[PDB]
């Protein structure tokens, strides 16, 4: 800790403030996530236990690198590689102009590789939203904030009451499914894809029921043909309005026939048929992908 000079605060994401800091000896700029130990009521919080244990196994160019954990009596310090900003802020500032298509494809391609790497190491992220996606000035993008991530060596049981974001939540979870699967990550990612493309959140719901109905209204209301099982899901009702599957051309105008095709595969209703991150990397949409750098 003596070696670090706090430069400025860059805020929070689940638990404890985040600072930009420089190593006074090597000169590296790092991001310090600092956690207060309530050493008399809770201990090390479970967000930290998970993010540290999980992120220590994952070493990949599209997953934020955990450099060191500095482990004192009263404080835990997490030291990460520094990254200039998140995609959420970027989309706010690229708003009105849009994010250039080609950077969209680069971003998605890189996210898919990070995801694919998590999922092949039995790690679920579970909380993919743009504020968790960190970009630098060289055009890279990385999965961050593994506070909620879980190992799925055994299947992961769903929180009856989700502290786990609304807009990017999969329909199987909204319909009271009882396990997560890698499909929930793919769903978030597809929403975030349409968000970059159209410039606003695909399904910005206001409760769980509003979420479903916003999804149902765009993708059409599921039945047993599209989604074998739906009608026997704890939170399903025979009374749900029956909407029609809107044309994807209308949902994501700026996108070509291949984008639309991939997008719709990442948003299949049936978790069993939803495209995996491995398979998505093979998609024709990625044929001309390059590595442009943002105007940041």
């Amino acid at each position: 800790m003596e070696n670090f000079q706090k430069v400025e605060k860059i805020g929070e994401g689940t638990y404890g403030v985040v600072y930009k800091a420089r190593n006074k000896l090597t000169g590296e700029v790092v991001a310090l996530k600092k956690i207060r130990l309530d050493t008399e009521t809770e201990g090390v919080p479970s967000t930290a236990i998970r993010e540290i244990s999980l992120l220590k196994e994952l070493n990949h160019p599209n997953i934020v690198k955990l450099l060191d954990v500095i482990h004192t009596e009263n404080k835990l310090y997490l030291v990460f590689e520094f990254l200039h900003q998140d995609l959420k802020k970027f989309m706010d500032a690229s708003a009105l102009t849009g994010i250039p298509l080609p950077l969209i494809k680069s971003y998605l391609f890189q996210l898919l590789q990070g995801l694919a790497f998590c999922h092949s190491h039995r790690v679920l992220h579970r909380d993919l939203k743009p504020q968790n996606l960190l970009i630098n000035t060289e055009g890279a993008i990385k999965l961050a904030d593994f506070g909620l991530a879980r190992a799925f060596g055994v299947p992961v049981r769903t929180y009856t009451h989700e502290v786990v974001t609304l807009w990017y939540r999969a329909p199987e979870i909204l319909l009271g499914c009882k396990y997560y699967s890698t499909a929930v990550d793919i769903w978030s990612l597809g929403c975030i894809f349409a968000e970059m493309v159209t410039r606003r959140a695909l399904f910005p719901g206001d409760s769980e029921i509003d979420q479903l109905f916003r999804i149902f209204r765009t993708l059409g209301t599921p039945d047993e043909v599209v989604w074998p099982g739906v009608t026997s899901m704890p939170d399903y009702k025979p009374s749900f309005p029956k909407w029609a599957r809107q044309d994807f051309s209308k949902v994501v105008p700026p996108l070509d026939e291949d984008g639309r095709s991939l997008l719709s595969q990442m948003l299949h209703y049936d978790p069993n048929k939803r495209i995996s991150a491995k398979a998505a990397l093979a998609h024709p949409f990625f044929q001309d992908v390059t590595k442009p750098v943002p105007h940041l």
């Binding site: 809770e42 479970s46 482990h71 092949s120 398979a279």
Partner: protein, 258 residues
């Protein structure tokens, strides 16, 4: 599901070798014994029943205890503190809402303080260098079950049962990787319920032939015969539940055709 099954299986095989305890460690412990360790693990099975903890959480806690007692000496009077911190850490990592620290202090019968348990928690984290995502018998059993045809769930319980049994006795079980124990437990349960046998699917997947399982299976088969007698009865009492199809009431086979 099955886009990553095999990557996962392969990678759990790699991790399990990283997360292996030192096998002759109880001998280097001057004040604690395999038998004390059995007392502690059985007590953990009960704490887990009581708070409705997942079974995974128990296997995790057992792995932490054994990697810990592997590099740190503990006097008998602190063994349980190491166990309680272990259970707390396993809960935070695996459970949705972990029981609070007060609760863990509470179930030792205020035998340590809330701050002792937290200082122990920190010290376990340091010794395990935060490596908590450990592969368990329960993990491999869960992977194995995808390969059974048709699914028998008396088979599953009975396998889980045998796999929990093996946690109690470092006596033979620290010699086997979790993937090997899960293997013999699966075969033994399949066998006992139906007379079938460690399937070809899983020979090709695990590269474990029935023959390679034979040493572990023999110990396991001994454990299963002697279960009703063992000093520790917690796992049996647990596995009497209708939730488990009272598999621990079922009759062990006396021979194995091995």
């Amino acid at each position: 599901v099955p886009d990553y099954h095999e990557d996962i299986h392969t990678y759990l095989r790699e991790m399990e070798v990283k997360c292996k305890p030192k096998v002759g460690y109880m001998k280097k412990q001057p004040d604690i014994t395999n038998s004390m360790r059995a007392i502690l693990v059985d007590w953990l099975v009960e704490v887990g029943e009581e708070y409705k903890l997942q079974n995974e959480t128990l296997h995790l806690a057992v792995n932490y205890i054994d990697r810990f007692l592997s590099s740190m000496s503990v006097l008998r009077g602190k063994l349980q503190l190491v166990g309680t911190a272990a259970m707390l850490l396993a809960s935070k990592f695996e459970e949705i809402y972990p029981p609070e620290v007060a609760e863990f202090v509470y179930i030792t019968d205020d035998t340590y303080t809330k701050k002792q348990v937290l200082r122990m928690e920190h010290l376990v984290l340091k010794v395990l260098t935060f490596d908590l995502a450990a592969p368990t018998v329960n993990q491999f059993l869960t992977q194995y079950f995808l390969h059974q045809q048709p699914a028998n769930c008396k088979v599953e319980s009975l396998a889980m049962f045998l796999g929990e049994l093996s946690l109690i006795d470092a006596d033979p079980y620290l010699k086997y990787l979790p993937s090997v124990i899960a293997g013999a437990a699966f075969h033994l349960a399949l066998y006992t319920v139906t007379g079938q046998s460690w399937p070809e699917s899983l020979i090709r997947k695990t590269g474990y032939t029935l023959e390679s399982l034979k040493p572990c299976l023999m110990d396991l088969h001994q454990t299963y015969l002697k279960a009703p007698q063992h000093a520790q009865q917690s796992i049996r009492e647990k596995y009497k539940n209708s939730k488990y199809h009272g598999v621990s009431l079922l009759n062990p086979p006396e021979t194995l055709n091995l």
